[PDB]
Ligand binder design. Structure first.
Ligand SMILES: Nc1ncnc2c1ncn2[C@@H]1O[C@H](COP(=O)(O)OP(=O)(O)OP(=O)(O)O)[C@@H](O)[C@H]1O
Ligand SMILES: Nc1ncnc2c1ncn2[C@@H]1O[C@H](COP(=O)(O)OP(=O)(O)OP(=O)(O)O)[C@@H](O)[C@H]1O
Ligand SMILES: [Mg+2]
Ligand SMILES: [Mg+2]
Ligand SMILES: [Zn+2]
Lengths: 633, 173, 208, 189, 432
């Protein structure tokens, strides 16, 4: 009534006080308008802006406090004012055939500092209901996208006029209203037959996601907790399972909560939900300074050595394995070939070695430094847990598929630990993914082929406790030959007792164990708790890790080298020399070694930020594979 | 200006960003690079007992002081939004002393209007937690006293001790 | 860099202050830090050598003056910082010593009978000397114009004329003005407060 | 002086000392009138003590009264404000005016505690009722102090009728907060 | 209403007139609780018996009816001693010293009576929402209405107040107030189970300020009301019993999340620092390990070192270094190997004792289960999940099957458990 109009006036004043929002409205409007005029087209921007809570805090403390504390009485007044401003801006007429019926009202999004309203799915209780909150977590489950009716239009014969009926739901609006039965009117007020006219009605896409707490922040002895978020309109399909997200929305109650005709019970409570306003991913955009630095650092001669050594500075030695990991990070170029085939561009590495040889501390580093990485353990995994699982969608009722570890890491890496301890029934599935890079599901009436293009790095142990040099290589490794053929580089690492090596490595380890984080006193235990302050503002030389991430991203997305003849000449001579020799290698040499040389050469070419494969790339690939197969170093 | 104050001595040893405005040889142990001389337009973090003086002597001084990370716009916005809930200990253990120091070197009226309000709003919670003497017959206190600056702990201890002595004398039988 | 070690010394001082602040009863100073202090002494000596070297290298005229001024200022500032840290540590330890010296009714402290609060070897030799002259100063204060008032007496106001006391340690008969007290252990006395202030202060009596 | 803080704040015992350095009225149970050994005090006038007659009203300093009541030679009369009627009047005045402090003597808490401890028999009203009324007054005064603490600044404050013990228990917080605010303001000039 | 007013008056006089020596303890506790935003009050029953026996007798025979009256008396006193009003209804927490009743001695004789019992927490549920103030509107005449509910066991009116339908009323969810509800599961003490019987379990409900206070495996003491609720089992007129918690005492100081903050008053901190300064503290701690075992000094020193544990470091490159100690005892029979394992279980604040023969990889690391109702898959903890931040003692370690023993390799060093089963792919923390 009066309060609604007063708040509309307040927000209207706020809008012309700061001119940025008015300019963004015009930019979106002109973009959408002149896009439709391009008949010879080469797509549509949604009606949603992002305002900062901070600026509103200086403008009007009362309105900011109302939005943060009582959103359900201050957001709808703001949306009407934004719609009015947007309607005022659009001077050009749009006599469209059916856009007159559906207005697509403008909505709002928020950013800035939330103070005490930044929480997690665990610290959210009944004290935060009907409040604007932001929750950080990991997406686990998503529902199928369905259309929902918002307004129905009917045509009346013998009169020629139209009649519309509006529908509302608890999840649709922020205010509780009288419910609607969602049944189309059939009789006019005068009794004339009504015909439903699809194409003038309004439907909106609806989705439900589940956000779980980060497992690293959970208390001792407790399992992580999860919450449900509802997305609508233009927020649909902006998240996938496994993603790390931050969702800003209104925490809301729903239902009757067992205080009704049903029997009295202590086990019945209310249901809680979040109507998300905004979603933020917790792709690093690069400026011209960063790109210029990358191009300047590319021209240095010893760039490969620096890049490889920058990996895991807390590991002493293992230079060649660290080079192989870097070559994994910058994968090869995939070739699509006739007969529906593709040559894989991924590099797969296996490490077999003695106990306590820093095999498992490199997989953990790859988990952190890479863009996408999935961790797996041999004994705690199953075949149905790696490829896909048949489940049900509670909200709609169909039967669907849920992704597994391999398919969730498409265009990523999978790090498997204790690979030899995996059961045989489990080990067949990974075989297919390593060969075809596709999963075939033919269960419960769901016949589908799923794409899985991932790089595999694995660590295992020999049959006995330690590697034996007096026995043949195949006796030492329990893995079958078919599985072993699918790895590009097999590294056998051994711990040998030598006084100088021990003196150096012990010094390095003792130096590492004496590190104090900044801002901590001696003897002060590390407080890895953050004190519930999740965030302050809601949205020889070595190189730093973020710079390496930028370098890897830029190389993967900007250069695609092509093979040359003079590199092929080196590759063929290396292959012919390696094949025809009496040296006893730890792995047999076959016709698939040539493809490994090609892939390593392509990766080294990408490292140099060049569009051609040179002779030096072939030499580096040859040296790496000679070290891997022979140990001639 | 307390020569013998321990806390002032500690707070005066913090590291601030700065940039060399000249080119000079002979240095380098500032960068932990002994033989290498320092170049022009080099950004290093120097302690406050050195950067304060190096920015005065030259005219243009030898070194320029760069805006600190603890006085960014994010920290000011967080202070303004919710003063009590903010964890000043994580930002810096000596926030207030460095705040008055920064106001003194560079006259900033905006910072003097924000720090005063922050202190005034946190004093109420400090008094509330200091006045709560337990009776023999909470999580809030433990949570709050872990967010206190080095200066505020002294005030908390003084107020708590005074309250306990007053209560002890009142109920001595 | 140069002064980074001295900061550690200052940190140690802070810890001692806490023991001084959170002290229901009198405490003892921890061990001296002669090794850290000697390290600052060595580094300030090296700074003096560097300043000398800069002096000659400038006065032969191979280097620009503006260049030499910067390292001169740096060395001077580092020496000043080291002096500040050492002086702050010394003054805190001196203040605690003065407090203890006052809180033992004057007397010669370690030479005579002490209340066993402090071990001999914690203090430095110069601190041991300083304590001796400070105690002598207290002594010849107490014999000044304020003879009647006991400047080393109790600092809690008198509000109870007659008190009950209990003996902690056994002793013999002690004469007091106009009478005698027999200090049989595990016995209780009802007597005026003024007579037993000395004996309570020295640990031969309990309660008040 | 130096030990156990005491640098810039008084201990409760010293406040009690200051309170006991104040006069009070008594009814002597002995007659020491001169005939028709003497007190000869150096810090208090001894004229009343020298000229004493039984069953008559005189006034002396408080600590002498406590020393006499330790024996059976005195009976201290509590002040007129230590009554249920006069306490209920002050409670009502306290309720009606929520922005000023009631006019109570600057030693009401200390005097009440001392008199309840020592001279329990001399009161006319039941002592439990008075003890409850004192707590009732103290709680409301605490509420007003808590509300008034919000108006802290760098210039000056006015606490017109606050008691001695209430001032003492609040001095270290108030002084230090205003000192820090004053330094922050001065720095920006 | 002519008795409830007098009951509330009696409670308010108890709160305002109880005194021991020279201090109103229950009047001071309220003011101290209000300052730190604790809206509750703890009352000892012995004081209530001493003050007046009729008041205690009224409570002892009708708890669900009398307790809310004390609840509103507390918040009436609070608004008088705090304000000259966003104060919700306070909570009453009770302490008792009566005899403890075993779980298996609870029967139909103890219905609607306050009891005291002890057991072991095995599971804690998630928090749920319960309404206290409900805003209500009618579907036809559309007028505002309100309802107030107390959680001591209501429905919307089956009528209309001012044709409207039978029971037309909807809840306006905004402007409604809710509180926190939690469900816990108990079990008997292992030594009190009768002969040849398996241990039995029971259900408890806690509210508001008693949620997130216990963790599974803890030994606790519970004061509450034994009640029944009709629900749902082919028996006629049968009901299911449960307990509504009123007071909790826990041995472990740790809360649900283990705040990693001090829960020690200065009187105990002084004792601990005095203990730490003992020149022969090492010998004192060593002699305290199993005083009934002769010799074996080095093993006891190793046990002390394991109990204290080392330091944990995190490095800039993301590396994590273990800070826990593992100990193996391979020896001859009769050498008291198994009498030290059970002592370490007792002394450690958090500890689990298991046998290698009766074990499995799922039981040790984690399991995956299907909910009968929701029909989805969820993760359930195991021996190494319960014993987080503590010690696990595995006896008969040589008799373990080779498949089950290998599942501990990652947890021993990397201190994580990776599960990639049935559409669930997570990594759980385990520092044991
Ligand atoms: N070269 C090294 N540099 C630094 N630390 C090392 C090195 N080799 C081993 N370590 C240390 O050894 C410990 C165990 O290493 P890690 O867990 O990676 O071994 P692993 O090869 O996975 O062993 P396992 O065969 O038992 O599974 C860690 O603390 C790690 O830091
Ligand atoms: N040193 C000892 N001091 C006291 N009692 C002892 C000692 N050694 C053995 N015992 C006693 O021997 C009995 C059996 O010991 P226990 O059960 O610990 O054997 P164990 O070492 O686990 O044997 P096993 O290898 O056969 O499993 C117990 O009653 C225990 O008290
Ligand atoms: Mg490993
Ligand atoms: Mg055994
Ligand atoms: Zn109606």
């Amino acid at each position: 009534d009066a309060v609604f109009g007063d708040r509309v006036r307040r927000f209207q004043e706020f809008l012309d006080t700061f001119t940025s929002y008015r300019d963004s409205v015009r930019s979106i409007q002109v973009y959408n308008s002149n896009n439709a005029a391009n008949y010879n087209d080469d797509n549509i921007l949604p009606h949603r802006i992002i305002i900062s809570l901070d600026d509103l805090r200086e403008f009007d403390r009362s309105f900011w406090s109302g939005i943060l504390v009582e959103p359900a009485y201050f957001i709808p007044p703001a949306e009407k004012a934004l719609t009015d401003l947007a309607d005022s801006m659009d001077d050009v007429p749009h006599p469209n055939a059916s856009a007159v019926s559906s207005r697509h009202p403008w909505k709002l999004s928020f950013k800035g500092s939330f103070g005490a309203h930044a929480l997690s799915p665990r610290t959210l209780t009944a004290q935060h209901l009907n409040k604007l909150v932001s929750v950080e977590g990991i997406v686990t489950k998503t529902s199928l996208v369905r259309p929902k009716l918002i307004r129905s239009v009917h045509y009346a014969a013998k009169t020629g006029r139209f009649h519309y009926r509006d529908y509302t739901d608890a999840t649709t609006t922020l205010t509780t209203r009288i419910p609607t039965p969602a049944i189309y009117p059939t009789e006019d007020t005068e009794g004339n037959k009504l015909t439903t006219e699809y194409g003038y009605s309004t439907f909106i896409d609806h989705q439900r996601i589940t956000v779980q707490e980060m497992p690293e922040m959970a208390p001792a002895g407790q399992l992580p907790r999860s919450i449900d978020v509802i997305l609508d309109d233009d927020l649909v399909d902006k998240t996938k399972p496994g993603d790390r997200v931050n969702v800003v929305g209104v925490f809301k109650s729903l239902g009757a909560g067992g205080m009704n005709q049903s029997n009295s019970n202590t086990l019945i409570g209310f249901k809680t939900l979040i109507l998300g306003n905004t979603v933020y991913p917790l792709r690093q955009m690069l400026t011209d300074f960063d790109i210029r630095n990358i191009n300047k650092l590319s021209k240095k001669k010893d760039i490969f050595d620096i890049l490889s050594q920058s990996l895991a500075p807390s590991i002493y030695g293992h230079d060649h394995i660290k080079k192989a990991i870097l070559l994994m990070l910058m994968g090869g170029v995939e070739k699509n070939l006739e007969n529906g085939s593709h040559l894989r561009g991924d590099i797969n590495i296996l490490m077999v070695g003695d106990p306590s040889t820093a095999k498992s501390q490199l997989l953990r580093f790859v988990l952190n430094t890479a863009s996408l990485a999935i961790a797996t353990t041999g004994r705690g995994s199953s075949g149905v847990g790696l490829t896909a699982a048949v489940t049900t969608d509670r909200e709609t009722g169909e039967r669907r598929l849920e992704a597994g570890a391999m398919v969730l890491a498409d265009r990523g890496v999978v790090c498997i630990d204790e690979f030899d301890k995996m059961t045989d029934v489990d080990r067949v599935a990974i075989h297919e993914v390593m060969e075809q890079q596709t999963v075939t599901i033919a269960k419960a009436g769901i016949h589908t082929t799923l794409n899985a293009r991932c790089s595999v790095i694995a660590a295992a142990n020999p049959v006995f406790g330690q590697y034996d040099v007096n026995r043949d290589p195949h006796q030492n490794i329990a893995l079958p030959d078919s599985l072993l053929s699918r790895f590009d580089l097999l590294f056998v690492v051994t711990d040998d007792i030598n006084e100088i090596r021990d003196r150096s490595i012990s010094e390095h380890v003792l130096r590492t164990h004496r590190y104090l984080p900044p801002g901590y006193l001696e003897g002060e235990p590390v407080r890895e708790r953050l004190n519930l302050s999740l965030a302050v503002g809601e949205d020889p030389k070595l190189v730093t890790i973020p710079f390496l991430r930028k370098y890897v991203q830029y190389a993967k997305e900007r250069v695609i080298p092509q093979l040359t003849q003079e590199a092929i000449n080196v590759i063929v001579k290396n292959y012919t020399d390696l094949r025809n020799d009496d040296n006893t290698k730890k792995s047999p040499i076959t016709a698939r070694t040539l493809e490994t040389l090609i892939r390593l050469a392509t990766a080294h070419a990408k490292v140099r930020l060049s569009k051609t494969v040179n002779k030096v790339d072939a030499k580096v690939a040859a040296n790496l594979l000679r070290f891997a197969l022979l140990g001639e170093d | 200006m307390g020569y013998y104050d321990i806390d002032d001595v500690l707070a005066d040893g913090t590291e601030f960003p700065c940039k060399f405005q000249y080119d000079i040889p002979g240095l380098g142990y500032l960068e932990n690079n002994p033989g290498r001389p320092i170049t022009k337009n080099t950004k290093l973090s120097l302690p406050l007992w050195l950067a304060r003086i190096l920015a005065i002597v030259g005219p243009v001084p030898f070194v320029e002081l760069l805006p600190p990370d603890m006085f960014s716009t994010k920290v000011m916005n967080a202070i303004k939004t919710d003063p009590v809930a903010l964890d000043l200990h994580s930002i810096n253990s000596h926030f207030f002393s460095l705040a008055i120091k920064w106001i003194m070197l560079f006259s900033e009226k905006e910072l003097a209007n924000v720090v005063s309000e922050l202190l005034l709003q946190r004093a109420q919670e400090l008094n509330h937690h200091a006045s709560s003497l337990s009776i023999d017959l909470n999580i809030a206190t433990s949570t709050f006293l872990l967010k206190l600056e080095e200066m505020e702990k002294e005030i908390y201890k003084k107020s708590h001790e005074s309250y306990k002595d007053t209560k002890r004398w009142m109920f001595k039988k | 860099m140069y002064g980074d070690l001295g900061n550690k010394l200052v940190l140690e001082a802070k810890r001692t202050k806490q023991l001084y602040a959170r002290s229901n009863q009198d405490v003892n100073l921890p061990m001296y830090h002669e090794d850290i202090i000697r390290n600052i002494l060595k580094e300030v000596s090296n700074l003096r050598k560097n300043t000398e070297y800069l002096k000659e290298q400038q006065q032969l005229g191979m280097l620009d003056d503006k260049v030499a001024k910067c390292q001169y200022f740096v060395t001077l500032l580092c020496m000043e910082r080291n002096k500040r840290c050492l002086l702050a540590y010394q003054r805190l330890r001196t203040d605690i010593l003065d407090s203890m010296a006052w809180n033992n009714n004057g007397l010669d402290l370690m030479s005579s009978i002490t209340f066993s609060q402090q071990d001999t070897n914690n203090l430095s030799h110069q601190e041991q000397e300083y304590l001796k002259e400070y105690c002598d100063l207290i002594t010849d204060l107490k014999s000044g114009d304020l003879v009647d008032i006991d400047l080393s007496g109790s600092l809690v106001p008198p509000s109870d004329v007659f008190i009950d006391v209990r003996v902690l340690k056994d002793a013999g008969e002690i004469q007091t003005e106009y009478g005698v007290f027999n200090l049989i252990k595990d016995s209780q006395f009802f007597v005026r407060q003024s007579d037993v202030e000395r004996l309570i202060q020295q640990g031969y009596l309990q309660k008040i | 002086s130096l030990p156990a803080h005491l640098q810039q704040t008084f201990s409760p015992e010293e406040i009690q000392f200051i309170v006991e350095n104040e006069p009070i009225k008594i009814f002597p149970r002995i007659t020491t009138r001169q005939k028709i050994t003497r007190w000869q005090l150096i810090t208090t006038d001894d004229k009343a003590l020298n000229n004493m007659v039984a069953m008559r009203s005189t006034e002396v300093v408080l600590w002498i009264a406590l020393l006499l009541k330790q024996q059976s030679k005195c009976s201290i009369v509590a002040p007129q404000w230590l009554t249920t009627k006069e306490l209920d009047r002050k409670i009502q005045y306290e309720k009606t005016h929520p922005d000023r402090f009631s006019e109570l003597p600057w030693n009401w808490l200390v005097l009440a505690r001392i008199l309840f401890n020592k001279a329990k028999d001399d009161f006319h009203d039941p002592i439990h009722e008075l003890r409850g009324k004192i707590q009732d007054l103290r709680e409301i005064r605490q509420i007003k102090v808590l509300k008034g603490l919000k108006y802290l600044n760098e210039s000056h404050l006015q606490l017109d009728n606050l008691s001695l013990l209430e001032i003492n228990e609040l001095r270290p917080f108030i002084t230090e907060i205003m000192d820090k605010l004053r330094e922050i303001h001065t720095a920006s000039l | 209403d002519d008795d409830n007013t007098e009951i509330i008056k009696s409670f308010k006089n108890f709160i305002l007139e109880f005194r021991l020596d020279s201090q109103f303890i229950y009047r001071d506790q309220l003011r101290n609780n209000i300052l730190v935003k604790n809206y509750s009050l703890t009352v000892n029953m012995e004081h209530l018996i001493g003050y007046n026996e009729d008041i205690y007798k009224k409570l002892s025979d009708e708890p669900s009816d009398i307790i809310p009256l004390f609840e509103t008396a507390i918040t009436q006193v609070a608004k008088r001693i705090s304000i000259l009003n966003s104060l919700p209804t306070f909570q009453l927490i009770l302490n008792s010293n009566a005899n403890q009743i075993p779980l298996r001695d609870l029967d139909s004789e103890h219905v609607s009576k306050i009891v005291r019992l002890s057991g072991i927490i095995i599971s804690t549920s998630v928090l749920s929402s319960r309404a206290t103030y409900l805003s209500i509107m009618c579907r036809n005449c559309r007028h505002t209405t309100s309802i107030t509910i107390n959680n001591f066991n209501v429905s919307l009116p089956r009528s209309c107040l001012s044709n409207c339908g039978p029971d037309p009323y909807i809840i306006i969810h905004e402007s409604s107030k809710f509180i926190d509800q939690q469900f816990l599961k108990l079990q008997e003490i292992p030594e009190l189970v009768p002969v040849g019987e398996m241990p039995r379990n029971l259900t408890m409900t806690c509210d508001r300020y008693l949620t997130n206070k216990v963790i599974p495996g803890t030994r606790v003491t519970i004061v509450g009301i034994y009640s029944i609720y009709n629900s749902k089992g082919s028996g006629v007129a049968i009901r299911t019993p449960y307990i509504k918690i009123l007071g909790i005492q826990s041995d472990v100081e740790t809360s649900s999340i283990w705040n990693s903050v001090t829960m020690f008053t200065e009187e105990e901190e002084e004792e601990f620092l005095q203990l730490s300064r003992n020149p022969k503290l090492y010998e004192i701690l060593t002699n305290s390990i199993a005083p009934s075992i002769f010799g074996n000094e080095d093993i006891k020193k190793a046990i002390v070192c394991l109990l204290m544990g080392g330091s944990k470091k995190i490095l800039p490159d993301g590396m994590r270094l273990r800070g826990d100690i593992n100990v193996l005892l391979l020896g001859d029979p009769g050498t008291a190997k198994s009498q030290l394992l059970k002592f370490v279980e007792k002394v450690s604040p958090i500890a689990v004792y298991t046998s290698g023969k009766g074990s499995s990889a799922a039981g040790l690391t984690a399991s995956v289960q299907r909910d009968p109702m929701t029909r989805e898959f969820y993760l359930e903890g195991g021996a190494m999940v319960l014993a987080d931040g503590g010690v696990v003692c595995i006896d008969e370690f040589d008799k373990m099957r080779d498949e089950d023993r290998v599942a501990i390799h990652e947890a021993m060093e990397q201190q994580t458990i990776s599960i990639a089963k049935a559409g669930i792919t997570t990594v759980l923390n385990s520092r044991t």
